[PDB]
Design a protein around this ligand. Structure first.
Ligand SMILES: O=c1cc(-c2cc(O)c(O)c(O)c2)oc2cc(O)cc(O)c12
Length: 274
C-alpha cells in the first residue's frame, strides 16, 4: 500500500490540533485533508477494535465515521516513526465558522438556526456512536459554502461517551461549563449543551458571551446585539448554571425558535451567495 497513494498540496492550517494539508487521493482524484500529529505531542491514547495502540482521535473518528454527514469522515490513516497521518475528507469550497463570523460579524437568526440545527444533528450522531466531542466551537465547524452544510472537526480533545462523571478536560476553557471551572467535574451531555449554548450566543452576537472564569461561574448573559426573545430564552436555558436545568437535545430541537429550519441547499441559496 505505502503512504504514497495521495498527492500532497498546500498547508490549510496548523496549531494545537497539529498540521493539516491539502491532498488529493491519486487512486481516484478525490479531494482529501491530511493531518499530521506528532506521537510525542499526543496526550490521550486508546486502542482500536482490532487491538492496536492509536491516538484517541483515531478511535473516535472511526466510531463516528461510517455513514453520513455532520462530521468530516476519516477515510484512512498511517503510522510513521514519530507521527500519525490521518486522511480525512475535504469537501469544497469551505470556511470555518470562526473565520466566517470574523468576516460578517453576528449572523441573522434564520442563518444561525440552520447552522445551529445542523450542529445539533452532528452532535447527536457523535453521541450515538459513543463519542463526546468536548471541544465544540466555531473553529471546529466547517461550512461547505456550496452545499450549505456544516461538518465537525478536531476530536483530539474528545473522549468515549459515558454516563459517569468526567474529571478531565482538554478543550477550550471559555466554552467549558461552570461545574468544570469550580470542581473539575462534569457530565458529557450536560456540558455539551453548555458549549452549544456558548456557540449559539456566539453566532447571533458575533462573539462569545464569557471571556473570564468570573463570568462563567456567574452565568448571567448580556446581549450585545438585537436578538429575539425566543433566541435569548434558548441561549439562557442551554446556559443554566445547574447542569440538570439544561435542556436535552430533544428539548433544544423542539424549542419554539428551532421550527421551520432551512434545508442545507436553501441556506446557501439565501445566505452564502451560493
Ligand atoms: O478536515 C479538516 C479541514 C481543515 C481545514 C480545511 C481548510 O480548507 C481550511 O481553510 C482550514 O482552516 C481548515 O482543518 C482540520 C483540522 C482538524 O483538526 C481536523 C480536520 O479533520 C480538519
Amino acid at each position: 500500500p505505502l503512504e504514497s497513494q495521495y498527492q500532497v498540496g498546500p498547508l490549510l492550517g496548523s496549531g494545537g490540533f497539529g498540521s493539516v494539508y491539502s491532498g488529493i487521493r491519486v487512486s481516484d482524484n478525490l479531494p482529501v485533508a491530511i493531518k499530521h500529529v506528532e506521537k510525542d505531542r499526543i496526550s490521550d491514547w486508546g486502542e482500536l477494535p482490532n487491538g492496536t495502540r492509536v491516538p484517541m482521535e483515531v478511535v473516535l473518528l472511526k466510531k463516528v465515521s461510517s455513514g453520513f454527514s455532520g462530521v468530516i469522515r476519516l477515510l484512512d490513516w498511517f503510522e510513521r516513526p514519530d507521527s500519525f497521518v490521518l486522511i480525512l475528507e475535504r469537501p469544497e469550497p469551505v470556511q470555518d465558522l470562526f473565520d466566517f463570523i470574523t468576516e460578517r460579524g453576528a449572523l441573522q437568526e434564520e442563518l444561525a438556526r440552520s447552522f445551529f440545527w445542523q450542529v445539533l444533528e452532528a452532535v447527536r450522531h457523535c453521541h450515538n456512536c459513543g463519542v463526546l466531542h468536548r471541544d465544540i466551537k466555531d473553529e471546529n465547524i466547517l461550512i461547505d459554502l456550496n452545499r450549505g452544510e456544516l461538518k465537525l472537526i478536531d476530536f483530539g480533545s474528545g473522549a468515549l461517551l459515558k454516563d459517569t462523571v468526567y474529571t478531565d478536560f482538554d478543550g477550550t476553557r471559555v466554552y467549558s461549563p461552570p461545574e468544570w471551572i469550580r470542581y473539575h467535574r462534569y457530565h458529557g451531555r450536560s456540558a455539551a449543551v453548555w458549549s452549544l449554548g456558548i456557540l449559539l450566543y456566539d453566532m447571533v452576537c458575533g462573539d462569545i458571551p464569557f471571556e473570564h472564569d468570573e463570568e462563567i461561574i456567574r452565568g448571567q448573559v448580556f446581549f450585545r446585539q438585537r436578538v429575539s426573545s425566543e433566541c435569548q430564552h434558548l441561549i439562557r436555558w442551554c446556559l443554566a448554571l445547574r447542569p440538570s436545568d439544561r435542556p436535552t437535545f430533544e428539548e433544544i430541537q423542539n424549542h419554539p425558535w428551532m421550527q421551520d429550519v432551512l434545508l442545507p441547499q436553501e441556506t446557501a441559496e439565501i445566505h452564502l451567495h451560493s
